[PDB]
Structures are given as C-alpha cells and as structure tokens.
Amino acid sequence: EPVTHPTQMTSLDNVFDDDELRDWQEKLARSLGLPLDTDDFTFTGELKIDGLSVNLYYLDGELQWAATRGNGRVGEIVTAQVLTIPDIPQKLEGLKGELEVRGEVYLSRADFAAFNAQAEELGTPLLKNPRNGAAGALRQKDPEVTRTRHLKAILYAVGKRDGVPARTQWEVLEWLSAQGFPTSRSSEHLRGIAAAADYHARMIRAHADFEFDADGTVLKLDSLSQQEEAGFTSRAPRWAIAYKFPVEEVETVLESITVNVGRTGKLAPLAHLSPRLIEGSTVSKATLHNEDYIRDMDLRVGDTVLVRKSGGVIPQIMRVLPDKRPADAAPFEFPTHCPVCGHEAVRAEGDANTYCPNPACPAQSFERIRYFVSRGAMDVRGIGEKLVTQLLHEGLIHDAAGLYTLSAEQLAGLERGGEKKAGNILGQLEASKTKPLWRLINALGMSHVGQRNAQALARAFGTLEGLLAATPEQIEAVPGLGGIIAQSVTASLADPAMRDLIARLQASGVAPQ
Ligand SMILES: [Mn+2]
Ligand SMILES: [Mn+2]
Ligand SMILES: [Zn+2]
Ligand SMILES: [Zn+2]
Ligand SMILES: [Zn+2]
Ligand SMILES: [Zn+2]
C-alpha cells in the first residue's frame, strides 16, 4: 500500500574518478559563495550499499510505518517485514515530533549466493543482483518469508528531524547508534577532499573483505547548516554525492562446458575458464544458467569472454569477444540425454530448464525417495534421511519400489539393532498401499507436478490404468495443467525407469483408493 514520504527521498550524483571529485568540491564551494580554492570542508563517509533504500517514520517517538523509496515521494508500506529485521526499535523516549530515519536494507553475501545456488540446481527463478534480492525479501505478503531470509538493514541518515539535537552529520550517526539503531561499522569523520579520496581508496581495497556488497562510498557535508543551504540540483543535492567503485571485469578464455544434474533434475550447465584472479580469489568456474542463456549469449565453446562476480560473489559471465574468436569454434550442441544416467532429457514448451525423467539418475535417487516418504506423499514415518542414505550406500533399494521388497531382517539387521522400529517402518508401507491415488502421482516426484497438480491429475482420470493409458492430447486437456505441466507429465510416463518403478510398485501390491 502506497504512502507519501514526509520529506522527499532525493537521489545522489555520481563521481567515478578523482577529477570528478574535484569538480564536485568546486561545485559545492561555488554553491555556497566561497573562494574556489578551499579545503576546509569537513565530510562524513558512509558506504553505498547494494540493497534497497527504506524510510522509517516516528511520530511522538513511537513508530508509525516502514516504507520503501518507491519514486522518491511515494513509497510502499512494508511495515511488518521491516520489523522482522532484528535491531529495529519502535519507541523512543523523551522524543516528541516527526522523526524520519532513512536507511538501506541489504542482504548478506553468503545468504545471497546460497539463494541463487538453491535456484541453480532447482530451476526456480534466480536473483539478478543484491538490490532485487533485498526487494524480493521485503515485498512478500508473509513476513515469515522475510524472517527466514536473515534480512539485515543499516540506517545512515535522517530527514524530518523534529526533536533531534544533532547539528552535524557525524553527531547524527552518533545519535542514531545511541538510540539503538543498526549503524554502519565503517563510517569516518573526514576533513578535506584529500582525506575523502583516501577514505574512498581504502574502501576500494576493502571491497572484497565485507559481509555485504558495497558498490561505492557516500560523501556528505558535515555541517547541517551548510546542507540546508547548498540545496538540490533537481534530482540530487549539492551537499552529498556517491563515489562509485571501479568496475571489476576480467577478460579470460572459455575452455570446457560441463553439465550437472540437480537433485530435482535440473540439467544445469557449468562453464570452465582459465583461472584468473578477481579482487582476491581465483575464479575458474562460472554459472551458465540454462540453454537459452547460452544460445542468446552466443557462447560457442572455446570463445574468449569477459567475466565478473555478481555483487562480488557469484561468478557469472558477461559477453563474448568476436575479435578473438577461433574460426573453428562451433556452437555448443546442447546435450539431449542425461549425462549421468543416460535416459532422455526433454524440456517443456516455455520452461527454460531441461530436467531429467525418473530415479535411475543418482542425482535424483535420494531426493525422490525421501519425497516419496514425506507427509505430502505416502506418509511413511520412520524412514529418515539417515536411513535412506544407508540403503543407498549398501545398495538394497534402486527406486521407491525397493522399499516394499525389503524384509524385516534387512531393516532390523542394521545400526543400533532396531527391531521394533523396523516393525513400525514396515507397517507404514502396507498402510501406504491403500492410500488415495492422488498421493501416489505426487510421490513419483515429476517436474512441476506438485500436491495440487497431482490432485487435478487424479480427478482427471480416477483410475491408475487410465493415467498410464491416455494419449498426450487427452492429458493436456485437463483443467489446471496446460501445455507446460502436462507436457512434463507425458515425458515421465514415457520413460522406462518410471514405467519400471510403477510396475514394481503395483507388483508389490499398490491399489489406491
Ligand atoms: Mn561491489
Ligand atoms: Mn553490486
Ligand atoms: Zn576523470
Ligand atoms: Zn543468513
Ligand atoms: Zn536406466
Ligand atoms: Zn538422469
């Protein structure tokens, strides 16, 4: 829900090298009517954080709402999600008047890379940059989603300051941290344009050694009496500026392209390059995403390419270099079959991921077995992650049907000598055989086929034989599953390992309800 900011959140100008910072001081000293050759200016140096700017509003000391920047005048109320952020106060004593604290909600570099890595082997959408990741965490209807993402935030300015005794920006930061606000660890009280450029350089050589992406520094004029005088240009003020860090893009050569199979089945590619040093670490493997990403980038195997790290962490590629291409470099013939199991590998009409059929693929085996067992499937309490891993280390089960073919002595003759718990585990098996039919298709673990899609698939036919014996046209005509879900369903049943798993399942005695 939109809300109008009390004071408008203006943007900032950008300086990239030293000469542009000198023109910045020249513009500032001129806007105040001072001799151009002056270095008496006291500054304040924060960091430009790769996140989302957020504004707070405290009336009579008590918190009212938390909103995003939006367009600089009207933001979006994220009152509940910002309160999932830890050290966020809601009541300041001895304070009366409109308080407007400004800040920035960022996301940890490790929490950021672990998300895209989760999205890489799964096929679910991926985070572009730390700003979209912070916005993707804030803009969530359920605040528990934001709480489960470790959303961390920093506040580094104040606008409407009714009842704030701070008279300089350095005392603003002191007053913020004194009231219990989460402030920036690195913020220096600078004097002179030379000390500001030195500070910016020291943050450059500390860019990689942070827990959060900082894409530059922020230089503010110390005296508030001078801030409320220099004024604004049009979109940015004349008393504060952002000094961006230099770009970090290293040129290297692409060597080999490999493919890994995700636990779900995502056929995720991977690029291997000549090991080059970026900032500090030596990057040699780059994320390659999906097939259409390669085809759009025209990444013929053997090309020389540019590469960086997304937010300073995730190594993603940039583009190709046609001037340095070999004439014999052929376009990468994308694999049509699974590399680790051999079975066919086909993708849907619109889905960019490629996926893999059923369980013979060792990358899916463990995930398919434990998904077959959970509450969302066949309800087999007793069989846990520590037990399934042993059944694969010893090699007693192949797919989910191998569980029903086990004996009481095979499960009792294991670790800790559990006889009665093997009886409880066995009882859940035959009790699962007479469970409803919709719980079976979901337990197979096909792509896109969730708990809701498996129920609509069950209402489509009703009988198990009607699903195996049904043309692709009559199964694409089901309501709920168009031409992307139903197309992924047909590829599963057309696979022999799925037909073998289902046949062994009915051979053990599965007659759904
Ligand atoms: Mn950076
Ligand atoms: Mn960045
Ligand atoms: Zn320059
Ligand atoms: Zn975390
Ligand atoms: Zn096979
Ligand atoms: Zn496979």
Author numbering: 81 to 593
Task: Quote the study's own text.
Bacterial NAD+-dependent DNA ligases (LigAs) are enzymes involved in replication, recombination, and DNA-repair processes by catalyzing the formation of phosphodiester bonds in the backbone of DNA. These multidomain proteins exhibit four modular domains, that are highly conserved across species, with the BRCT (breast cancer type 1 C-terminus) domain on the C-terminus of the enzyme. The 700-residue protein consists of: (i) domain 1 which contains a N-terminal subdomain 1a and NTase subdomain 1b; (ii) domain 2 which is an oligo-binding (OB) fold domain; (iii) domain 3 which includes a zinc finger motif 3a and helix–hairpin–helix (HhH) subdomain 3b; and (iv) C-terminal domain 4 which comprises one breast cancer type 1 C-terminus (BRCT) domain. Regarding their functions, N-terminal subdomain 1a confers the enzyme’s NAD+ specificity, and the NTase subdomain 1b contains the catalytic site.
We determined the crystal structure of the non-adenylated apo-DrLigAΔBRCT to a resolution of 3.4 Å. MR search with fragments/ensembles from the predicted AlphaFold2 structure gave a clear and single solution. Due to poor electron density at the beginning of the N-terminus and end of C-terminus, the structural model only contains residues 81–593. Non-protein electron density was modeled as two Mn2+ in the catalytic pocket, one Zn2+ in the Zn-finger domain, and three extra Zn2+ cations at the protein surface. Because we purified DrLigA∆BRCT with subdomain 1a, but it was undetected, we infer that subdomain 1a was adopting different conformations in the crystal structure. Neither NAD+ nor AMP groups were found in the catalytic pocket bound to the conserved K128. Interestingly, we identified an unexpected two-metal center that stabilized the empty catalytic site. In our structure, the two putative Mn2+ cations placed in the catalytic site are predicted to interact with residues D293, D295, G391 and also residue D130 from the conserved motif KXDG. Considering different reaction stages and conformations of LigA, we could infer that our structure of DrLigA∆BRCT represents a pre-adenylation stage of the enzyme. Moreover, the ligase activity of DrLigAΔBRCT was preserved, but its affinity to dsDNA decreased in comparison to full-length DrLigA, and reinforce the assumption that the C-terminal BRCT domain 4 is involved in DNA binding.
